[PDB]
Structure 1
Amino acid sequence: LGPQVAEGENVFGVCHIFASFNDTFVHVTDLSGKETICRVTGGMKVKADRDESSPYAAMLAAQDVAQRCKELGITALHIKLRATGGNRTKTPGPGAQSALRALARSGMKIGRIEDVTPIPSDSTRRKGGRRGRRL
């Protein structure tokens, strides 16, 4: 099962790596992006909410999603790194970096790295008050 493409040419997928401040999401799609091939969250691998956003969970997610692409036949992936964005933090965290490193480790060719986070032009009001956020 998979595309009828010769061994020379490779097929491309887009791996939405979304590392929020609670877990990670691995949404492998077509180059169009409409239909999903796979998505491995942090919570599907570790049975603990404390370890949900751990780099170990992202590493396991990247390994499992790479196994899923090898079972179908995707050999090279473009990367769209993402953070929570918007009003919240814009920079992707350690989970995205760990997932990208683990996916590059498991024999997978890397195409274009793109930092696509929903950066607002002008934000709405912040989640916290005037006092602050994060302890």
Structure 2
Amino acid sequence: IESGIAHIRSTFNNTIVTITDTHGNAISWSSAGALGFRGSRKSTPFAAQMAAETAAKGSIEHGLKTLEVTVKGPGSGREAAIRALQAAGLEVTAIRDVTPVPHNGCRPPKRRRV
């Protein structure tokens, strides 16, 4: 177990990370909610930085050393997450901006000010 996928997802409200094998096999996971933040601090890239930190500790605990990372959703923890993952003793090889883009699909929910 040497190589893997880092599925990072950063919403406006939360940031959740899964370390996975390439063939769909998850090792461990964490989030700001997993680390204890309950309020608006979940959205902060700093909480995303600790989430990526403890994901990297779980990754080293199983034993893989090289990654490529896929990011989902619009958020703020992009640079902090990838820099924590690369500076936590791991290697990153590729960055993927995998966000689900419908052509139109179903209609989006309503506005916030009606």
Q: Do the structures match in fold with TM over 0.5?
A: yes
Measure the CA separation in 1 of the matches of 2:9 and 2:78.
7
- Is structure 2 residue 15 aligned with structure 1 residue 24? yes
The structure 1 residue matched to 2:41, chosen from 13, 26, 51, is 51
- 1:34-78, CA deviations, whole angstroms, 9 ceiling, x for partnerless residues? x21011112111333221121111111111111111111110111
Measure the CA separation in 1 of the matches of 2:81 and 2:61.
19
- Is structure 2 residue 59 aligned with structure 1 residue 69? yes
Moved more, 110-119 or 40-49: 40-49
Gaps of 5+ in 2: none
Map 1:1-135; keep pairs closer than 5 Å: 3=1, 11-33=2-24, 35-83=25-73, 92-129=74-111, 133=112
What is the number of equivalent residue pairs in this alignment?
A: 113
- Asked if the contact 2:12/2:76 (under 8 Å) is kept, the reply is no
Greater fraction helix: 2
> TM-score, length-normalised on structure 2?
0.88
Greater fraction strand: 2
Answer with 1 or 2: which has the greater Rg: 1
Gaps of 5+ in 1: 4-10, 84-91
